[PDB]
Amino acid sequence: AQVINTNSLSLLTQNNLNKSQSALGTAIERLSSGLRINSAKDDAAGQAIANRFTANIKGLTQASRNANDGISIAQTTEGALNEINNNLQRVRELAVQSANSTNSQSDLDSIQAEITQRLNEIDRVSGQTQFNGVKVLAQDNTLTIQVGANDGETIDIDLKQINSQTLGLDTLNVQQKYKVSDTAATVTGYADTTIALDNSTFKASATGLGGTDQKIDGDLKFDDTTGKYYAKVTVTGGTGKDGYYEVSVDKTNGEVTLAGGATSPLTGGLPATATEDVKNVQVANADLTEAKAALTAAGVTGTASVVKMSYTDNNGKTIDGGLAVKVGDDYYSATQNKDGSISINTTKYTADDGTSKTALNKLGGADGKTEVVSIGGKTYAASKAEGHNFKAQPDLAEAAATTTENPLQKIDAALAQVDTLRSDLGAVQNRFNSAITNLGNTVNNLTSVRSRIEDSDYATEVSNMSRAQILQQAGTSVLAQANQVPQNVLSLLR
């Protein structure tokens, strides 16, 4: 009978329990990791969204970091700014101190110097304060910080350029003008030029001494008491012609010629005042050679003269100033060099509309004695203009021209500006926090959602599938016993 085979089928179902044992193993597999890529995720997209949820928090952890970057930049902005308030308020203090009419002009100059220091510090803070390189107060700019998982989900920080100029205190001045005056300064002594003393021309101007040959022995002796040059002269072939002679010097090319058609040596020899040994033409600095060339190149028309400045305050007290090169009504601060020559002060600066350049220091400003300088169509303080680049950093206020009207109002309006900017930033923080809380709340919630897809087994469900393990194992046990039953049942026939 085919029962052996038909039973084999009934055993194939028992062997199918071995496949159910493969299901026990498959269950053990489903319980092994809890989750398997065996397509329990089909609307993969929908199930992928769970992984996107975690990716959201990944973007949200970076978001929290961002947020904290923003928070820090918020904190930092106010930090660096606090100093600015700290500086300006102090200026206010000087503004009160200034309104005092008992103050002398020297007092006012002193107060102005500290105001200038405070304003300069404000400008440094504005230019250097940074966060990760962002110059938070150097320019108007809105920083967008991604604090959410998706595009455009950001919190914006509106940064403003806060400096002396934007605050309207770039020319805040409390100084008063001094009555400017001068007196001629006939600077003394001589200096040597580039003009080298050419002696070859002497012997032909000294033929009237005769002999065979007339030559100057050594260097010419100059006399800074008379401006006269003298020469030791050896007249080869002559009788009583050797001795000291006064020589005429060509102040242009340096030629040396016997002076005054002298027919015999000076009585008494070389004068006692002729002690300098010169190799070059001496110039009574008095011609202001370089100063005059600088004035011409500058476009200055008038005749120049060296004067000593004087400044008189409101109380009739006068102090002496330095040396100056007066031209017309203008005064150019000057310096007298080693050799007694004089040079107009210059400041040295970069660009304007490209390249290195130079301007001459005039005496002006809010007090009448501040070194100012004209670049382009402007007139800045020399202190500011020194080493400045108008290419890399153009746009600027000239030097203060007069005393500032209503300085306390202006300063108040300035601080008001600083303050409102700070409110936006700090309130930004709290907004960041408020935003962190929205996202944060949804974060705790999203994690509750990934738990459905992010699936796996432990108590409740483990017991369901574990009880099922033993339940099905009971089944495999049933067919383990029932695995031996058939083979024997089939062998009963005799």
CSV table of C-alpha atoms in Angstrom, one decimal:
chain,number,residue,atom,x,y,z
A,1,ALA,CA,0.0,0.0,0.0
A,2,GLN,CA,1.2,3.5,-0.7
A,3,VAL,CA,0.6,4.3,3.0
A,4,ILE,CA,4.4,4.4,3.4
A,5,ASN,CA,4.4,7.3,1.0
A,6,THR,CA,1.1,9.0,2.0
A,7,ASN,CA,2.3,8.7,5.6
A,8,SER,CA,5.6,10.2,4.5
A,9,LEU,CA,3.4,13.2,3.5
A,10,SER,CA,1.9,13.2,7.0
A,11,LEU,CA,5.5,13.1,8.0
A,12,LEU,CA,6.4,15.9,5.6
A,13,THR,CA,3.9,18.0,7.6
A,14,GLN,CA,5.8,16.9,10.7
A,15,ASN,CA,8.9,17.9,8.8
A,16,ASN,CA,7.0,21.1,8.1
A,17,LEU,CA,7.1,21.4,11.9
A,18,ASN,CA,10.9,21.4,11.4
A,19,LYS,CA,10.1,24.3,9.1
A,20,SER,CA,7.9,25.6,12.0
A,21,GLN,CA,11.2,24.9,14.0
A,22,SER,CA,12.7,27.2,11.3
A,23,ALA,CA,9.9,29.5,12.4
A,24,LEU,CA,11.0,28.9,16.0
A,25,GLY,CA,14.5,30.0,14.8
A,26,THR,CA,12.9,32.8,12.8
A,27,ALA,CA,11.1,33.8,16.0
A,28,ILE,CA,14.4,33.5,17.9
A,29,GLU,CA,15.7,35.7,15.0
A,30,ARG,CA,12.8,38.3,15.4
A,31,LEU,CA,13.6,38.2,19.1
A,32,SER,CA,17.4,38.1,18.5
A,33,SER,CA,17.6,41.8,17.5
A,34,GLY,CA,13.9,42.6,17.7
A,35,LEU,CA,14.2,44.3,14.4
A,36,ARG,CA,15.1,42.8,11.0
A,37,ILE,CA,15.4,44.2,7.5
A,38,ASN,CA,13.2,41.3,6.2
A,39,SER,CA,10.7,44.0,5.0
A,40,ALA,CA,8.8,44.6,8.2
A,41,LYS,CA,9.4,48.2,6.7
A,42,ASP,CA,7.6,48.3,3.2
A,43,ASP,CA,6.0,51.7,3.2
A,44,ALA,CA,9.8,52.0,3.9
A,45,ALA,CA,9.3,55.6,3.2
A,46,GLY,CA,6.8,55.8,6.1
A,47,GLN,CA,9.1,53.6,8.3
A,48,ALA,CA,12.1,55.6,7.0
A,49,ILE,CA,10.4,58.6,8.5
A,50,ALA,CA,11.2,57.1,11.9
A,51,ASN,CA,14.8,57.2,10.9
A,52,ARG,CA,14.2,60.7,9.6
A,53,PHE,CA,12.9,61.4,13.1
A,54,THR,CA,16.2,60.4,14.5
A,55,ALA,CA,17.9,62.3,11.8
A,56,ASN,CA,15.7,65.3,12.9
A,57,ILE,CA,17.1,65.1,16.4
A,58,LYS,CA,20.6,64.6,14.8
A,59,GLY,CA,19.9,67.9,13.1
A,60,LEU,CA,18.4,69.0,16.4
A,61,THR,CA,21.4,68.1,18.4
A,62,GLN,CA,23.4,70.2,15.9
A,63,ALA,CA,20.5,72.6,16.1
A,64,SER,CA,20.9,72.8,19.9
A,65,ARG,CA,24.7,73.3,19.3
A,66,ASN,CA,23.8,76.0,16.8
A,67,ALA,CA,21.4,77.4,19.1
A,68,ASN,CA,24.0,77.6,21.8
A,69,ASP,CA,26.4,79.2,19.1
A,70,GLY,CA,23.6,81.7,18.6
A,71,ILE,CA,23.1,82.1,22.3
A,72,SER,CA,26.8,82.5,22.8
A,73,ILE,CA,27.0,85.1,20.0
A,74,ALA,CA,24.0,86.8,21.6
A,75,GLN,CA,25.8,86.8,25.0
A,76,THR,CA,29.1,87.9,23.3
A,77,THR,CA,27.5,90.8,21.5
A,78,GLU,CA,26.1,92.2,24.7
A,79,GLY,CA,29.5,91.4,26.4
A,80,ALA,CA,31.6,93.4,24.1
A,81,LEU,CA,28.9,96.0,24.0
A,82,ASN,CA,28.8,96.4,27.8
A,83,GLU,CA,32.3,97.9,27.5
A,84,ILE,CA,31.0,100.4,24.9
A,85,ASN,CA,28.4,101.6,27.4
A,86,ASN,CA,31.2,101.6,30.1
A,87,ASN,CA,33.3,103.8,27.8
A,88,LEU,CA,30.6,106.3,26.6
A,89,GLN,CA,28.9,106.7,30.0
A,90,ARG,CA,32.4,107.8,31.3
A,91,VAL,CA,32.5,110.3,28.3
A,92,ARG,CA,29.1,111.6,29.6
A,93,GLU,CA,31.0,112.1,32.8
A,94,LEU,CA,33.5,114.2,30.9
A,95,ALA,CA,30.6,116.0,29.2
A,96,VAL,CA,29.4,117.2,32.6
A,97,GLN,CA,33.0,118.0,33.6
A,98,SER,CA,33.3,120.0,30.4
A,99,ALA,CA,30.3,122.3,30.9
A,100,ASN,CA,32.2,123.9,33.7
A,101,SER,CA,33.1,127.3,32.8
A,102,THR,CA,35.8,127.5,35.4
A,103,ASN,CA,37.8,125.0,33.2
A,104,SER,CA,40.8,126.5,31.4
A,105,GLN,CA,41.5,125.6,27.8
A,106,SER,CA,44.3,123.3,29.0
A,107,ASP,CA,41.7,121.6,31.1
A,108,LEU,CA,39.4,121.2,28.2
A,109,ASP,CA,42.3,119.8,26.0
A,110,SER,CA,42.9,117.2,28.8
A,111,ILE,CA,39.2,116.3,28.9
A,112,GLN,CA,39.2,116.0,25.1
A,113,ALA,CA,42.1,113.7,25.1
A,114,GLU,CA,40.3,111.2,27.4
A,115,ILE,CA,37.1,111.6,25.4
A,116,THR,CA,39.2,110.7,22.3
A,117,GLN,CA,40.7,107.7,24.1
A,118,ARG,CA,37.3,106.5,25.1
A,119,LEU,CA,35.9,106.9,21.5
A,120,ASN,CA,39.0,105.2,20.1
A,121,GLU,CA,38.5,102.2,22.4
A,122,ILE,CA,34.8,102.0,21.3
A,123,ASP,CA,36.1,101.9,17.7
A,124,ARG,CA,38.6,99.1,18.5
A,125,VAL,CA,35.9,97.1,20.3
A,126,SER,CA,33.6,97.6,17.2
A,127,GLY,CA,36.4,96.5,14.8
A,128,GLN,CA,37.9,93.6,16.7
A,129,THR,CA,35.1,91.9,18.7
A,130,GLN,CA,34.4,88.5,17.1
A,131,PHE,CA,32.8,85.1,17.4
A,132,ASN,CA,34.3,82.4,15.2
A,133,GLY,CA,35.6,85.2,13.1
A,134,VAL,CA,32.3,87.1,12.8
A,135,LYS,CA,33.0,90.8,13.6
A,136,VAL,CA,29.7,91.2,15.4
A,137,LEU,CA,29.8,95.0,15.6
A,138,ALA,CA,31.8,96.0,12.5
A,139,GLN,CA,28.8,95.8,10.1
A,140,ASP,CA,25.0,95.7,9.7
A,141,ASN,CA,24.2,92.1,9.0
A,142,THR,CA,21.5,89.5,9.9
A,143,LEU,CA,22.8,86.1,10.9
A,144,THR,CA,20.4,83.2,10.3
A,145,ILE,CA,20.9,80.2,12.6
A,146,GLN,CA,19.3,76.9,11.8
A,147,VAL,CA,17.7,75.7,15.0
A,148,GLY,CA,15.1,73.3,13.5
A,149,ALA,CA,15.3,70.1,11.5
A,150,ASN,CA,14.2,71.7,8.2
A,151,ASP,CA,14.9,74.5,5.7
A,152,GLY,CA,14.3,78.0,6.7
A,153,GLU,CA,13.7,76.9,10.3
A,154,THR,CA,16.0,79.5,11.8
A,155,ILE,CA,16.3,82.3,14.4
A,156,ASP,CA,17.8,85.6,13.2
A,157,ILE,CA,20.3,87.8,14.9
A,158,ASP,CA,20.4,91.3,13.5
A,159,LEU,CA,23.9,92.6,14.1
A,160,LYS,CA,24.6,96.3,13.8
A,161,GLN,CA,27.7,98.4,13.1
A,162,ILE,CA,28.3,100.2,16.4
A,163,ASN,CA,31.2,102.7,16.5
A,164,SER,CA,31.9,106.4,17.1
A,165,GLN,CA,30.5,107.3,13.7
A,166,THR,CA,27.3,105.3,13.7
A,167,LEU,CA,26.7,106.5,17.3
A,168,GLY,CA,27.2,110.1,16.1
A,169,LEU,CA,30.1,111.0,18.3
A,170,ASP,CA,32.9,110.8,15.8
A,171,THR,CA,33.6,114.5,16.1
A,172,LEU,CA,32.4,115.0,19.7
A,173,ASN,CA,34.6,117.9,20.8
A,174,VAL,CA,34.6,120.0,24.0
A,175,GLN,CA,37.7,122.1,23.2
A,176,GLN,CA,37.9,125.8,22.5
A,177,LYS,CA,40.1,127.7,20.1
A,178,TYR,CA,43.2,129.4,21.3
A,179,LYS,CA,44.2,132.8,19.9
A,180,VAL,CA,47.0,131.7,17.5
A,181,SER,CA,50.0,134.0,17.0
A,182,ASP,CA,53.6,133.7,15.9
A,183,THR,CA,57.0,135.5,16.0
A,184,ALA,CA,59.8,135.1,13.5
A,185,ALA,CA,62.5,132.5,14.3
A,186,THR,CA,65.7,133.1,12.5
A,187,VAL,CA,67.1,129.6,12.9
A,188,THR,CA,70.9,129.6,13.1
A,189,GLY,CA,74.0,127.7,11.7
A,190,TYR,CA,74.5,126.0,8.3
A,191,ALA,CA,74.0,122.5,6.8
A,192,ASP,CA,75.7,120.8,3.9
A,193,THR,CA,74.0,120.0,0.6
A,194,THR,CA,74.5,117.5,-2.2
A,195,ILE,CA,76.6,120.1,-4.0
A,196,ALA,CA,80.3,118.9,-3.9
A,197,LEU,CA,83.0,121.6,-3.8
A,198,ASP,CA,84.6,121.6,-7.3
A,199,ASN,CA,88.2,122.9,-7.0
A,200,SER,CA,89.4,122.4,-10.6
A,201,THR,CA,88.2,125.9,-11.5
A,202,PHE,CA,90.5,127.6,-8.9
A,203,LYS,CA,93.8,127.7,-10.8
A,204,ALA,CA,92.3,129.7,-13.7
A,205,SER,CA,90.8,132.3,-11.4
A,206,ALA,CA,94.2,132.5,-9.7
A,207,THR,CA,96.4,133.3,-12.7
A,208,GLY,CA,96.7,136.8,-11.5
A,209,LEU,CA,98.9,135.5,-8.7
A,210,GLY,CA,101.2,134.2,-11.3
A,211,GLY,CA,104.1,131.8,-10.9
A,212,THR,CA,103.7,128.7,-12.7
A,213,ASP,CA,100.9,127.0,-10.7
A,214,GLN,CA,98.2,127.8,-8.1
A,215,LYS,CA,96.6,124.9,-6.2
A,216,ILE,CA,94.5,124.6,-3.0
A,217,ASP,CA,96.2,122.5,-0.3
A,218,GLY,CA,93.5,120.3,1.1
A,219,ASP,CA,89.9,121.0,2.1
A,220,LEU,CA,88.3,124.4,2.1
A,221,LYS,CA,87.8,126.0,5.6
A,222,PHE,CA,84.3,127.3,6.1
A,223,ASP,CA,83.3,130.1,8.5
A,224,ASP,CA,79.8,129.8,10.1
A,225,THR,CA,80.2,133.4,11.4
A,226,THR,CA,80.4,135.0,8.0
A,227,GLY,CA,79.5,132.3,5.5
A,228,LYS,CA,82.9,132.8,3.8
A,229,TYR,CA,85.1,129.9,2.7
A,230,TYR,CA,88.9,130.1,2.7
A,231,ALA,CA,91.8,128.1,1.2
A,232,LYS,CA,95.4,127.2,1.8
A,233,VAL,CA,97.1,128.1,-1.5
A,234,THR,CA,100.5,127.0,-2.8
A,235,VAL,CA,101.7,129.2,-5.7
A,236,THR,CA,104.4,127.3,-7.5
A,237,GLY,CA,106.9,129.7,-8.9
A,238,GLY,CA,105.7,132.8,-6.9
A,239,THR,CA,107.4,135.1,-4.3
A,240,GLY,CA,105.3,135.8,-1.3
A,241,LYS,CA,102.1,134.3,-2.7
A,242,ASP,CA,101.5,131.3,-0.5
A,243,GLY,CA,99.1,131.6,2.4
A,244,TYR,CA,95.3,132.0,3.0
A,245,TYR,CA,92.8,133.1,0.4
A,246,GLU,CA,89.1,133.7,0.5
A,247,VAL,CA,87.3,131.7,-2.1
A,248,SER,CA,84.0,132.2,-3.8
A,249,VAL,CA,81.7,129.2,-4.0
A,250,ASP,CA,79.1,128.7,-6.7
A,251,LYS,CA,76.0,127.9,-4.7
A,252,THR,CA,74.5,125.8,-7.5
A,253,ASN,CA,77.2,123.5,-8.9
A,254,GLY,CA,80.0,124.0,-6.3
A,255,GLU,CA,82.8,125.7,-8.3
A,256,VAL,CA,85.7,127.3,-6.3
A,257,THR,CA,87.3,130.4,-7.5
A,258,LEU,CA,89.7,132.9,-5.9
A,259,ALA,CA,87.6,135.7,-4.4
A,260,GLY,CA,87.8,139.4,-4.9
A,261,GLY,CA,90.7,139.2,-7.4
A,262,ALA,CA,93.0,139.0,-4.4
A,263,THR,CA,96.6,139.9,-5.3
A,264,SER,CA,98.2,138.7,-2.0
A,265,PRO,CA,97.4,136.4,1.0
A,266,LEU,CA,95.1,137.5,3.9
A,267,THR,CA,96.8,139.5,6.6
A,268,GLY,CA,96.9,137.3,9.6
A,269,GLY,CA,96.3,134.1,7.7
A,270,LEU,CA,93.1,132.1,8.3
A,271,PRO,CA,90.4,133.7,10.4
A,272,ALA,CA,89.8,132.1,13.8
A,273,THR,CA,86.1,131.6,13.0
A,274,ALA,CA,86.9,129.5,9.9
A,275,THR,CA,87.2,126.1,11.7
A,276,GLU,CA,85.0,123.8,9.7
A,277,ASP,CA,86.5,121.6,6.9
A,278,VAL,CA,83.9,121.3,4.2
A,279,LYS,CA,83.7,119.1,1.1
A,280,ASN,CA,80.2,120.4,0.2
A,281,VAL,CA,78.4,123.7,-0.3
A,282,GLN,CA,77.0,125.0,3.0
A,283,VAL,CA,73.5,126.4,3.0
A,284,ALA,CA,72.0,129.0,5.4
A,285,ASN,CA,69.1,126.6,6.1
A,286,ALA,CA,67.3,129.9,5.8
A,287,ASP,CA,66.5,129.2,2.1
A,288,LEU,CA,64.2,126.4,3.4
A,289,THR,CA,65.2,124.2,0.5
A,290,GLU,CA,63.2,121.0,1.3
A,291,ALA,CA,60.4,122.8,3.1
A,292,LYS,CA,59.9,125.1,0.1
A,293,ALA,CA,59.9,122.2,-2.4
A,294,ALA,CA,57.3,120.4,-0.2
A,295,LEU,CA,55.2,123.5,-0.2
A,296,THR,CA,55.4,123.8,-4.0
A,297,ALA,CA,54.6,120.1,-4.6
A,298,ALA,CA,51.6,120.6,-2.2
A,299,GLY,CA,50.3,123.4,-4.4
A,300,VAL,CA,51.0,126.0,-1.7
A,301,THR,CA,51.4,129.5,-3.4
A,302,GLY,CA,52.8,132.0,-0.8
A,303,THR,CA,56.2,132.8,0.5
A,304,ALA,CA,57.4,130.6,3.4
A,305,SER,CA,59.0,131.7,6.7
A,306,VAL,CA,59.9,129.9,10.0
A,307,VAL,CA,58.1,131.1,13.0
A,308,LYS,CA,57.6,130.2,16.7
A,309,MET,CA,54.0,129.5,17.6
A,310,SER,CA,52.2,130.9,20.6
A,311,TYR,CA,48.7,130.1,21.9
A,312,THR,CA,46.6,132.4,24.2
A,313,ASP,CA,43.7,131.0,26.1
A,314,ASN,CA,40.6,132.9,27.3
A,315,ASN,CA,42.4,134.1,30.5
A,316,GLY,CA,45.2,135.8,28.7
A,317,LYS,CA,47.7,133.1,29.5
A,318,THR,CA,50.0,132.2,26.6
A,319,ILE,CA,52.2,129.1,26.1
A,320,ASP,CA,54.8,128.7,23.4
A,321,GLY,CA,54.2,126.2,20.7
A,322,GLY,CA,56.7,124.6,18.3
A,323,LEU,CA,58.3,125.8,15.1
A,324,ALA,CA,56.2,126.3,12.0
A,325,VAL,CA,56.5,127.2,8.4
A,326,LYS,CA,54.1,130.1,7.9
A,327,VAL,CA,52.6,130.4,4.4
A,328,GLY,CA,49.9,133.0,3.9
A,329,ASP,CA,47.6,132.6,6.9
A,330,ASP,CA,48.3,128.9,7.2
A,331,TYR,CA,50.8,127.3,9.6
A,332,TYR,CA,52.6,124.0,8.9
A,333,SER,CA,54.1,122.3,11.9
A,334,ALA,CA,57.8,121.9,11.3
A,335,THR,CA,60.8,120.4,12.9
A,336,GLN,CA,64.4,121.5,12.9
A,337,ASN,CA,66.8,118.7,12.1
A,338,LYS,CA,70.3,117.9,13.3
A,339,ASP,CA,72.2,120.2,10.8
A,340,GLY,CA,69.8,123.1,11.6
A,341,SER,CA,67.7,122.6,8.5
A,342,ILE,CA,63.9,122.5,8.8
A,343,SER,CA,61.3,120.1,7.5
A,344,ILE,CA,57.5,120.3,7.4
A,345,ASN,CA,55.8,117.4,9.3
A,346,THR,CA,54.2,114.7,7.2
A,347,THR,CA,52.1,111.8,8.4
A,348,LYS,CA,52.6,108.7,6.0
A,349,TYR,CA,49.4,106.9,4.9
A,350,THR,CA,48.2,104.1,2.6
A,351,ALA,CA,45.8,104.5,-0.4
A,352,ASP,CA,43.0,107.0,-0.9
A,353,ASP,CA,41.9,105.7,-4.3
A,354,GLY,CA,44.9,103.3,-4.5
A,355,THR,CA,48.6,103.7,-3.5
A,356,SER,CA,51.0,105.2,-0.9
A,357,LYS,CA,50.8,109.0,-0.5
A,358,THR,CA,51.8,111.9,1.7
A,359,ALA,CA,50.2,115.2,3.0
A,360,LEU,CA,51.6,118.1,5.0
A,361,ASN,CA,50.7,118.8,8.6
A,362,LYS,CA,48.9,122.1,9.1
A,363,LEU,CA,48.0,123.6,12.5
A,364,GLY,CA,44.3,123.8,12.9
A,365,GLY,CA,41.6,121.6,14.4
A,366,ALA,CA,39.1,122.5,17.1
A,367,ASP,CA,41.7,124.2,19.3
A,368,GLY,CA,43.8,126.0,16.6
A,369,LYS,CA,46.9,124.0,17.4
A,370,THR,CA,46.0,120.4,16.4
A,371,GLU,CA,48.0,118.9,13.5
A,372,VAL,CA,45.5,118.3,10.7
A,373,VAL,CA,46.0,117.1,7.2
A,374,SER,CA,44.2,117.5,3.9
A,375,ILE,CA,43.7,114.3,1.9
A,376,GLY,CA,41.3,114.4,-1.1
A,377,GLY,CA,38.8,117.1,-0.3
A,378,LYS,CA,39.0,116.5,3.4
A,379,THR,CA,41.0,117.6,6.5
A,380,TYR,CA,41.5,114.9,9.1
A,381,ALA,CA,43.6,114.9,12.3
A,382,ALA,CA,47.1,113.7,11.6
A,383,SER,CA,46.9,111.3,14.6
A,384,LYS,CA,44.0,109.5,12.9
A,385,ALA,CA,45.4,109.7,9.3
A,386,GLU,CA,48.8,108.2,10.2
A,387,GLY,CA,49.2,104.7,8.7
A,388,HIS,CA,45.6,104.8,7.5
A,389,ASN,CA,44.2,103.0,4.4
A,390,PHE,CA,41.3,104.7,2.5
A,391,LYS,CA,41.2,101.8,0.1
A,392,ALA,CA,40.7,99.0,2.7
A,393,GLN,CA,38.9,101.4,5.0
A,394,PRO,CA,37.4,104.6,3.3
A,395,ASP,CA,34.4,106.6,4.5
A,396,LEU,CA,35.4,109.0,7.3
A,397,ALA,CA,34.8,112.2,9.3
A,398,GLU,CA,37.3,115.0,9.1
A,399,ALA,CA,38.8,116.5,12.2
A,400,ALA,CA,36.5,118.3,14.6
A,401,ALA,CA,36.1,121.9,13.5
A,402,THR,CA,34.3,123.5,16.5
A,403,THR,CA,32.8,122.7,19.8
A,404,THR,CA,29.9,120.2,19.8
A,405,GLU,CA,26.5,121.8,20.5
A,406,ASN,CA,24.3,119.8,23.0
A,407,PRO,CA,26.9,117.0,23.6
A,408,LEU,CA,24.9,115.4,26.5
A,409,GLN,CA,21.8,115.0,24.2
A,410,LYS,CA,24.0,113.5,21.4
A,411,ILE,CA,25.6,111.1,23.9
A,412,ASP,CA,22.2,110.2,25.2
A,413,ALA,CA,20.8,109.4,21.9
A,414,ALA,CA,24.0,107.4,21.2
A,415,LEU,CA,23.6,105.2,24.3
A,416,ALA,CA,19.9,104.8,23.5
A,417,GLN,CA,21.1,103.2,20.2
A,418,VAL,CA,23.6,100.9,21.9
A,419,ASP,CA,20.9,99.8,24.4
A,420,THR,CA,18.0,99.0,21.9
A,421,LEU,CA,20.5,96.8,19.9
A,422,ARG,CA,21.3,94.9,23.1
A,423,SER,CA,17.6,94.4,23.9
A,424,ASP,CA,17.1,92.7,20.5
A,425,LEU,CA,20.0,90.3,21.2
A,426,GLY,CA,19.2,89.3,24.8
A,427,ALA,CA,15.6,89.0,24.0
A,428,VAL,CA,17.0,86.8,21.2
A,429,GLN,CA,18.5,84.5,23.7
A,430,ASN,CA,15.2,84.0,25.6
A,431,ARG,CA,13.7,83.5,22.1
A,432,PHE,CA,16.3,80.9,21.4
A,433,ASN,CA,15.3,79.2,24.7
A,434,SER,CA,11.6,79.5,23.8
A,435,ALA,CA,12.4,77.9,20.5
A,436,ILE,CA,14.6,75.3,22.1
A,437,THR,CA,11.5,74.4,24.3
A,438,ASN,CA,9.1,74.1,21.3
A,439,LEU,CA,11.6,71.8,19.4
A,440,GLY,CA,12.6,70.2,22.7
A,441,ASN,CA,9.0,69.3,23.5
A,442,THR,CA,8.4,67.8,20.1
A,443,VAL,CA,11.8,66.0,20.4
A,444,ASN,CA,10.6,64.2,23.5
A,445,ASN,CA,7.4,63.4,21.6
A,446,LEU,CA,9.1,62.2,18.4
A,447,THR,CA,11.2,59.9,20.3
A,448,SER,CA,7.8,58.4,21.6
A,449,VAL,CA,7.0,57.9,18.0
A,450,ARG,CA,10.1,56.2,16.7
A,451,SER,CA,9.3,53.5,19.3
A,452,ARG,CA,6.6,52.1,17.1
A,453,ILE,CA,8.7,51.5,14.0
A,454,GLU,CA,11.9,51.1,16.0
A,455,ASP,CA,10.6,47.9,17.1
A,456,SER,CA,11.7,45.0,19.2
A,457,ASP,CA,10.9,42.5,21.9
A,458,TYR,CA,11.2,42.5,25.7
A,459,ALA,CA,8.5,41.9,28.5
A,460,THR,CA,4.9,42.2,27.2
A,461,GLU,CA,5.7,41.5,23.6
A,462,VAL,CA,8.7,39.1,24.6
A,463,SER,CA,6.3,37.1,26.7
A,464,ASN,CA,3.9,37.1,23.7
A,465,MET,CA,6.6,35.7,21.4
A,466,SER,CA,8.5,33.8,24.2
A,467,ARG,CA,5.3,32.0,25.3
A,468,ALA,CA,4.9,31.5,21.6
A,469,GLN,CA,8.5,30.1,21.5
A,470,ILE,CA,7.6,27.4,24.1
A,471,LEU,CA,4.0,27.1,22.8
A,472,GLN,CA,5.4,26.3,19.3
A,473,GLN,CA,8.3,24.3,21.0
A,474,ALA,CA,5.5,22.3,22.6
A,475,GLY,CA,4.3,21.8,19.0
A,476,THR,CA,7.8,20.8,17.9
A,477,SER,CA,7.9,18.5,21.0
A,478,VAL,CA,4.6,17.0,19.9
A,479,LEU,CA,6.1,16.3,16.5
A,480,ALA,CA,9.4,15.3,18.0
A,481,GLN,CA,7.6,12.4,19.7
A,482,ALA,CA,5.3,12.1,16.6
A,483,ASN,CA,8.5,12.0,14.6
A,484,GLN,CA,9.4,8.5,15.9
A,485,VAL,CA,5.8,7.3,16.1
A,486,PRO,CA,5.2,7.0,12.3
A,487,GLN,CA,8.5,5.3,11.2
A,488,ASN,CA,7.7,2.5,13.6
A,489,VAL,CA,3.9,2.4,12.8
A,490,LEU,CA,4.9,2.0,9.2
A,491,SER,CA,7.1,-1.1,10.1
A,492,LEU,CA,4.3,-3.1,11.8
A,493,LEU,CA,3.2,-5.2,8.8
A,494,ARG,CA,4.2,-8.8,8.6
